[PDB]
């Protein structure tokens, strides 16, 4: 396989379906990436992650650069070998969780994580898709602060590009994505898109939109922001999201997604179904012998009842977290498969309407 | 298969190896039963429990009779269906954890759990091997109190027998074990063995010895206590134990074992190896790329390093509990397999010596 090749096989409106071919595997798009917060997708063996249909996972960098440390993971053979996942891994830059979980300057953030150090950490982990180091502008932001933040991020995008390219093994085997910023402002989104395309990246993320602005506003910003990106490269909406967010983002040209919702909320008792989410802890499930979802093909829904999973979660049992997480990730992957197939068949608009009618009934 | 058939295929000294055939499967003896505290072997899917080699699990009754309740589990189809384990389950009486986790009388314990109610709860769960309801005499015990406790337990053993036999479906499909008590006193152990054999049971447990008396004293009591039991029925040492305890108990005629040590201590970071236990949290493992044990055939030792499991456990990650638990239960099952094979081949005494020489090196 090549280092990186994105091919679009079918289109419907702004929606696209296709593949990204990388050295460690093929990624079917639109793609959902389960999140590994600290070298594990919580409560799942990697073979179970793969069994749900995931082609690629997102590895957070922030925790690993603190413990065990990027150099130690490299010494142990890289993140893939360490955690036992041999397919592509996309790593974030570590900057976002540095702020959320500090002194910012033009050189980077002290808490020193510079663009150069972020790229190096992602190299030491052995990332397949490296994210440029930037700032996720807070929401809401004044136009002046959004502009200042975006402009710095574009300077850091060039520094990220140059650091990536300076390291032969990384440039030849990994890919690099740039991140569009600009808050909710069309002119800043355009300037950011232009700056990133001038630098040149393997894919383009839409950053700064998983920030509490609400779906209407997110969709409004995507409406004008995604067309600004190069059409022939993947479009990655970072940190999104709920099932209906994903469907509407695909309708607007997004190819890649990640979020902790299916894993984190799964451990908290929320199960996704085609009839909307349910909280399995609710007393109404105490004697419900049906599976979590009536159509889901996952191993959890083949074998165990709502009643049992209700009992496990209310008991705090580890198997409850395991089963909820496997189902939720499998549900997300089945959603992505239905999206891909419906685009391929030119019936995605109908699928989106049917999905929403039943999910929000 | 029959309701119950214990066959001894080979013997060496007091040690025996053979099979128990029951409706839901064959149990290879000597057997180790992983413990399911509340309708789950903590952090393992049932298919993973089976993959380690377990033929039967122990289901604690105490938590389940409180939540969800025995009647509710019966309404949902029984414990086997509820938790997804279709092979034999041995259930305890619930009385021990009633005391540890109260008003005792001749009728039972209020906290009302009588012998009759304990047998009924185990029936409602769908137990394959039902334990008579008794008292685990505290250690140490005066001869007078040990005698009083043992005598009551023998009255309760007859009540347990009669309750079991009164219920046609249970009498025809499950088995019933009686429990020898008597603390550390030979005369009381003999009276208890005699009383149980007069009543008649499918198997005989040695109760009251997982109670902090130390291995020397446990072995001393087993030396005279196991020969008192019917030779042609299984001998079950409740709540034991560490690997060397199991080896020495088999040397003394025990056929069945259970304890929480491999599961509970696994989640706490203790891994069993043929060179003795290790605490994987110790800094010495932070860069150790070897598997938990150099010879272990389990899936964990095929795929992941000490260094990774060290990281997971020190991070509190659920996958750390999962991997430690699978390895520890697999280690116990491999110990039981080596015991069975060495008895079958007439080299168990040599195996015991070789095992101790390396485990305690
Ligand atoms: Zn499912
Ligand atoms: Zn192992």
UniProtKB/Swiss-Prot annotation, chains A, B:
Changing residue 258 to N: Abolishes catalytic activity. It is an enzyme of class 2 (transferase). It catalyses: 7-aminomethyl-7-carbaguanine + guanosine(34) in tRNA = 7-aminomethyl-7-carbaguanosine(34) in tRNA + guanine. The active site is at residues 92, 258. Binds 1 zinc ion per subunit. One of its GO terms (biological process) is queuosine biosynthetic process. Its EC number is 2.4.2.29. Residues 239-245, 263-267 are annotated as: RNA binding. Its cofactor is Zn(2+). The keyword Metal-binding applies. Homodimer. Within each dimer, one monomer is responsible for RNA recognition and catalysis, while the other monomer binds to the replacement base PreQ1. This is Queuine tRNA-ribosyltransferase. It comes from Zymomonas mobilis subsp. mobilis (strain ATCC 31821 / ZM4 / CP4). The gene is tgt.
